[PDB]
Write an enzyme that holds these catalytic residues in place. Structure first.
Site, PDB file in Angstrom:
ATOM      1  CD  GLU A 123       0.191   1.049   3.205  1.00 52.42           C
ATOM      2  OE1 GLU A 123      -0.383   2.112   2.887  1.00 52.42           O
ATOM      3  OE2 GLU A 123       1.109   0.997   4.049  1.00 52.42           O
ATOM      4  CG  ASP A 169       0.361   0.479   7.357  1.00 53.58           C
ATOM      5  OD1 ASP A 169       1.410  -0.187   7.236  1.00 53.58           O
ATOM      6  OD2 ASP A 169       0.273   1.675   7.010  1.00 53.58           O
ATOM      7  CG  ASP A 187      -4.098   1.170   9.512  1.00 52.51           C
ATOM      8  OD1 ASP A 187      -3.961   0.341   8.591  1.00 52.51           O
ATOM      9  OD2 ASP A 187      -3.737   2.362   9.412  1.00 52.51           O
ATOM     10  CE1 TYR A 199       9.217  27.991   3.215  1.00 49.01           C
ATOM     11  CE2 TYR A 199      10.607  28.562   5.074  1.00 49.01           C
ATOM     12  CZ  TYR A 199      10.425  27.912   3.873  1.00 49.01           C
ATOM     13  OH  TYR A 199      11.454  27.181   3.329  1.00 49.01           O
TER      14      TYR A 199
END
Ligand SMILES: COc1cc([C@@H]2c3cc4c(cc3[C@@H](O[C@@H]3O[C@@H]5CO[C@@H](C)O[C@H]5[C@H](O)[C@H]3O)[C@H]3COC(=O)[C@H]23)OCO4)cc(OC)c1O
Ligand SMILES: COc1cc([C@@H]2c3cc4c(cc3[C@@H](O[C@@H]3O[C@@H]5CO[C@@H](C)O[C@H]5[C@H](O)[C@H]3O)[C@H]3COC(=O)[C@H]23)OCO4)cc(OC)c1O
Ligand SMILES: [Mg+2]
Ligand SMILES: [Mg+2]
Lengths: 778, 778
Positions: free
Chosen positions: A24, A125, A127, A386
DNA sequence: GAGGTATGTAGGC
DNA sequence: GAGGTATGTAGGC
DNA sequence: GGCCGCCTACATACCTC
DNA sequence: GGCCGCCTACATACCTC
């Protein structure tokens, strides 16, 4: 094909013995590279021979919504792939790597033997994002085009442990795969002694020895997907087709796998597709719904409430400007955001944006830098590196009181406190902001209401002196909705109109017939004002009547000139046939915008809730704020009683310290014994001085007992008579406040109604101060 | 040309009125976009007409080192551009935008009129990196190719304020441009009352109102570069040509501009190129030298020691694993690193790397994740997001003692303390590590010595019982260098040899004549072992004698098989003509590596220093450690005397508290008065309990005075007799330690020599523990 | 005797 | 009556 | 979320007369 | 250090018969 390291001895006579590792992401790519390059000293494990590696590049495109299935009337059902579906890089790369074709059905053995790889193994993963979404989309793709591959076990996945618990002295872990299983094991365990718990929220979290141990048994943890007869309807429901078909599917909740089913899965590595869709995909869908749909109480999602809690903690000590990336890192570190920092920084930037037509009418941050103007729709914001943000400390402190925060329910991540489950502001944010987000079955669109009608409604509900108080309560009883709720006119020079059951926002234009230039100075509510001119330059006949379009608009204002044909000015009137709701010029320039609202929110419990009107959302938000005020007053009363008794005991000891003279006693045991002998009350001063998140019952049950540290911990400087007099005056003030609180609990509409009124006035003043300073309070 | 928004009305008859804005980066691009898109309400300021915008993409390529100036013998000096110089994207894009050709000399007015823009304006951050390096390189390019453009004012820059001080009630700032000017103004000011100081370390730091005010006066702050007769030699010295010509130029220091010169610059915006090269470019060169060259005392650069101090502060409370990006953000936030995090994360990864041949033989961090193996030379490390680090707490605490860190000189950034100016550890890191870095005139190459010769030298210097102590001191006196220093053999299965004045590292190989395969198991010291096979596959004749090269090496080990032609085995011996220092096979396979050392370091003051041998570096590092030990013992003695007297006073008060009975005194004033009357000593206990960064003289001058808070701040629990007995025992222990310290100051070689010896033993033990655990101390 | 080509390191744009 | 095309939002990969 | 041009020196290779 | 493919729904445009 990029990110594809070809396996040697693949595509030839030995291709049936090679597997393709679909990753993935690039972290999974690195893990696979380490495992396959283990090489020597690990002969049993796989190497780059017979094992190809390819990256999915994140989530993949849903092909169920791309295929058309047209012209099936010829006696055969032919499925036509979309041009966007044809031109996708990752899918065509996978097709090229496997050597498969869409026309062929892989029924017999020879057709599967034509493949360049024996099987495809997915590594994701452990999850919801990846196991249920990416793998779910890949499975849906393969099922949609080649069901026989799934039937004959061509598709499989490698499963990785989500949680590992190591017992001291033993090298083997328990490698639990789901949170529920780990919780059941932990509650089954007598105690967590000599146990180290490690969470692997991503494949890259695994260590070198861990990946070596995994790839030593790489023949294991490989589960083949099997297709059932019931999987077709599940695949249709979860991916592709109408949304409503999954709406009623996602309003129930995930059904956990039975013990026998999990035992079958682990005994023989054959995962049915139906079970995967039922558990992992549905869990991902529910999580995405709870993640992308705001809660109606605070009007903000899990990400934005997490960001707000992180900002409250970060800027509490000092309101110094913080860079967006630094603040995002702080939020991820302290609020346990385990997704990334690209999306977190983007969410922070969006939350801190403030311009006419922006999503946030009352941002929680004041932004220092270039956050983007209305012309690019917030897309012209600078890089997070920034750009600085500050907490709108006064607005937040008047809108989200800290004493309320103490009593909110909280989300606990791995046993550690995190951002609150939901905030309960003094005014409903779900009604006061803009938003337009899809989420896995439900769309959320909200148009902010005026901060004069909402204030009138809330004040009439709270203030008993309001002439419409009883009428408003009767309306609450029977849904009359006597008072009006109207869209906000702030930062909008146009005018809102209502026709039938819909509201329309109109821009304003100026016609100079002698000059033959059409000047538009205000566009619809949320149009980007630059994509607008692109839309008007791309309408084929609309552009014919005009010659030039020039944008003289500066920041925060709109001023666009349209030079059209000299003879077209009347012809446009004949071209578009103006109606009673929009003029001919408004029709020609698309200056009317019908504003639609999809009032879909998430309940505090975690479900989905749909409101037909904004009155319903307000009426749902009111009781939560009432109960929060009542319980906050009750907790204040209890803690103030405890503080008064503690301070009276402290003053008594300060008075009698000369007589007691504890300077000649052995230690804290003897001192506590003699203090108890003299009648001093035992109580834990740490909880009294700061109850934090302590409910009434636990506050009482902990304050009844304790030690005498309050007496022992006080310094010598407090023995001076000025300190004692200050303490006595403090006791008097606290007892007066206690009497006032007891009066507050007996208020006629409900306890703390007056406090709600003063809070409302304070937040209104803060909001006015923000509006008249361009949300730059300095 | 990418990142180039063409100015309208440019390149035509009005091109002479258009200017090109050369931005060093995209933040400058965003600032220019905001300024030019101000548009309406700012008619005096410029817009995108007559103002083009182009990005330099960071630093540019130095063309002085690419031009060849060949075949000038034809009567004309023709300069030939290098193919790398021709193919550069940014320079050719600028040339295309301007419409400049290299052949033409822009002498007359018509040639300059042929240009597509009137002039080129450079916008860079007001710092050394960009004003002196990027602008310096651009100026060098233009001077090298078209001097007449600089002469006739074609090149100019826009200057931005580095520091702005706002006085309360006044809207105009002082806009100072250099640190020295701001310091002179601040010391000229009587006090910093009602003054707000803002630093702009980058163009993107400016705010919306600030950029609006700047672009309102955009006709100002534009300075044209002028060419002088002396600028040619300066341009040759700073850019291009031999390095030595700038070596003697960078050993002096920057000469500040005279007041008359600065007044002339600000009066008429005509900056000579010679002055710019003298000030800004030279300051950048000196800063880069101090940034990329390690200090010989600690052997680490400014960024690396900044990272070390940040890690010491971060992991002091808890040694929990931290992600590389999170740790870099922490270092930037706390140590005031104002450059970025890409370089910071790369430096952290390099510091935490540990493999055979790595730069850091004793890393300051232990890395959790994949930091890269010896095969890719550390280039195969994972992304900083999914990689964790921990502080090697015991190694650092035994190698960089905290009590030493209290007494180091420190770098102050904007009046706030930062990482120490330099570390002085118990053993010289500059001698025990590897490195190969160029830096603006000087190259730094170091090969680590063995940690047996260094230990012997240091122990002989410190231990008076060592038989070579007097001999070593005489060697220090007259540079005999009696004891040997040899390169380290750790993680190196080869053998080192010395010939003439150079050391050579040899890999080892095994020849199997019957098998005709050459097996190499160890390569030279720092070869990447994968670029090595690329080098051996690219040598034309070396590849002819061989057929195949296969790499069976796993991590941490080398094992490469070379299959060669059956009849070539003897022919190679005839082909290469082995010498007495390298064999025929070693010559054929490039298994010999001559190790060169460029011992160039930076002095603690801020200069450059060059050493002829490692003995010189050790002899320079010794006195600093001696003096630090002596002063640390002195400070310990003083603070221990102070703590003794404070604790005796505390115990006396605890004994007499019953008699004094300060419970009947009005406030702290009367309590202090009566304590002074009773003879209690006044002293600030905050400094006594923690002198932190305090010298002897200031410690005494602050301890002589103070308040009686020590008496008032003590709690009631301390009045118990057990606490008093514990305090008395603590006083006894501290007085015994004081006597031991007084004995230590009288030690024969020098004060604290024995402490140095125990420290050396402890750090050696910790180093060995790391060495035998693969630098994984857990 | 011929040099100019390409690489490569850490800390920066 | 014809639908399929493209866009676009926030939180994620 | 990876990937890619440059500076700086200096030594060491190759390549070509 | 910017930039770029995707999911999810839904309404509104255009486009083509
Ligand atoms: C290259 O390495 C990987 C990339 C990805 C994708 C990704 C994929 C892309 C792509 C871009 C991206 C990029 O998304 C971008 O983020 C930006 C963050 O700031 C906001 C403002 O704007 C976002 C862009 O709208 C979005 O496009 C990655 C961010 O995090 C991800 O997960 C994204 O353009 C082409 O295909 C997944 C992987 O495996 C898990 C990878 O290994
Ligand atoms: C696109 O926006 C800008 C980029 C830049 C350059 C840059 C320029 C590049 C380029 C890449 C880069 C990139 O450098 C890369 O950083 C990586 C950081 O991780 C380490 C491991 O490896 C580094 C690469 O070795 C390096 O190549 C930027 C990082 O910070 C910079 O300053 C770099 O490839 C092509 O040209 C300057 C600007 O203006 C100031 C910009 O606006
Ligand atoms: Mg994930
Ligand atoms: Mg800079």
């Amino acid at each position: 094909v990029d990110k594809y390291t070809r396996a040697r001895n693949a595509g030839g006579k030995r291709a049936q013995d090679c597997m393709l590792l679909a990753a993935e992401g690039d972290s999974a790519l690195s893990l696979l590279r380490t495992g396959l390059t283990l090489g020597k000293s690990n002969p049993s494990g796989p190497s780059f021979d017979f094992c190809g590696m390819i990256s999915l590049g994140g989530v993949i495109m849903n092909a169920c919504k791309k295929v058309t299935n047209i012209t099936t009337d010829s006696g055969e059902t032919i499925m036509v792939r979309n041009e966007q579906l044809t031109n996708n890089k990752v899918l065509q790369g996978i097709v090229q790597v496997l050597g498969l074709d869409f026309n062929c059905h892989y029924k017999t053995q020879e057709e599967r033997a034509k493949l360049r790889y024996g099987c495809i193994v997915a590594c994701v993963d452990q999850d919801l994002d990846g196991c249920g979404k990416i793998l779910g989309l890949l499975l849906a793709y393969f099922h949609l085009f080649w069901p026989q591959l799934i039937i004959h076990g061509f598709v499989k996945r490698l499963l990785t442990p989500l949680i590992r618990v190591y017992e001291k002295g033993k090298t083997m872990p328990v490698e639990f795969y789901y949170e529920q299983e780990f919780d059941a094991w932990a509650k089954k365990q007598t105690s967590l002694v000599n146990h180290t718990v490690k969470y692997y929220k991503g494949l890259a979290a695994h260590d070198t020895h861990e990946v070596k141990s995994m790839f030593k048994h790489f023949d294991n943890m490989v589960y083949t997907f099997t297709l059932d007869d019931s999987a077709k309807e599940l695949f249709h429901i979860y991916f592709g087709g109408e949304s409503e078909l999954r709406k009623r599917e996602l309003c129930t909740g995930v059904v956990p796998l039975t013990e026998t089913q999990t035992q079958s899965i682990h005994s023989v590595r054959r995962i049915p597709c139906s079970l995967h869709l039922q558990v992992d995909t549905k869990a991902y869908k529910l999580d995405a719904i709870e993640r992308q749909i705001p809660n109606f109480l605070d009007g903000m999602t899990r990400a934005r409430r997490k960001i707000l809690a992180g900002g409250v903690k970060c800027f509490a000590s000092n309101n110094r400007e913080r860079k967006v990336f630094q603040f995002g890192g702080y939020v991820a570190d302290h609020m346990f955001y385990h997704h990334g920092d690209m999306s977190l920084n983007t969410s922070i930037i969006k939350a801190a944006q403030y311009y006419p037509g922006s999503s946030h009418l009352y941002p929680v941050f004041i932004g220092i830098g270039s956050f983007g103007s209305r012309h690019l729709g917030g897309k012209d914001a600078g890089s997070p590196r920034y750009i600085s943000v500050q907490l709108a400390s006064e607005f937040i402190k008047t809108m989200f009181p800290a004493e309320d925060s103490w009593l909110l329910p909280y989300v606990f991540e791995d046993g550690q406190r995190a951002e609150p489950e939901y905030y309960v502001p003094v005014l409903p944010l779900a009604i006061m902001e803009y938003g337009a987000n899809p989420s896995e079955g439900w769309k959320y669109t909200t148009w902010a209401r005026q901060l004069e009608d909402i204030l009138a409604l809330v004040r009439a509900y709270v203030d008993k002196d309001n002439p419409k108080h009883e009428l408003l309560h009767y309306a609450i009883k029977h849904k009359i909705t006597i008072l009006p709720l109207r869209p906000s006119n702030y930062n909008f020079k146009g005018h809102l109109k209502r026709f039938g059951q819909y509201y329309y926002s109109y821009g304003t234009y100026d016609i100079s017939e002698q000059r033959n230039i059409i000047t538009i100075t205000e566009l619809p509510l949320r149009v980007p004002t630059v994509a607008y001119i692109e839309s008007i330059k791309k309408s084929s006949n609309r552009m014919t009547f005009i010659e030039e379009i020039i944008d003289y608009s500066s920041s925060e204002t709109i001023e666009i000139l349209v030079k059209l044909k000299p003879n077209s000015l009347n012809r446009i009137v004949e071209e578009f046939k103006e109606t009673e709701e929009q003029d001919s010029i408004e029709n020609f320039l698309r200056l009317r915008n019908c504003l639609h609202s999809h009032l879909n929110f998430v309940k505090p419990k975690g479900g989905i809730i749909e409101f037909n009107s904004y009155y319903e959302i307000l009426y749902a938000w009111l009781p939560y704020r009432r109960e929060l005020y009542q319980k906050r007053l009750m907790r204040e009363h209890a803690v103030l009683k405890l503080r008064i008794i503690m301070e009276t005991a402290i003053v008594r000891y300060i008075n009698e310290s000369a007589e007691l003279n504890l300077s000649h006693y052995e230690d804290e045991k003897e001192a506590s014994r003699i203090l108890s002998e003299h009648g001093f009350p035992p109580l834990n001063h740490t909880l009294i001085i700061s109850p934090e998140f302590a409910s009434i019952e636990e506050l009482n049950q902990k304050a009844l007992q304790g030690c005498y540290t309050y007496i022992l911990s006080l310094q010598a400087r407090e023995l001076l008579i000025a300190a004692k007099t200050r303490r006595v005056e403090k006791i008097k003030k606290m007892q007066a406040r206690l009497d006032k609180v007891e009066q507050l609990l007996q208020e006629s509409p409900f306890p703390g109604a007056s406090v709600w009124l003063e809070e409302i006035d304070a937040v209104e003043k803060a909001i006015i101060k923000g509006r008249n300073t361009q949300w730059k309070f300095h």
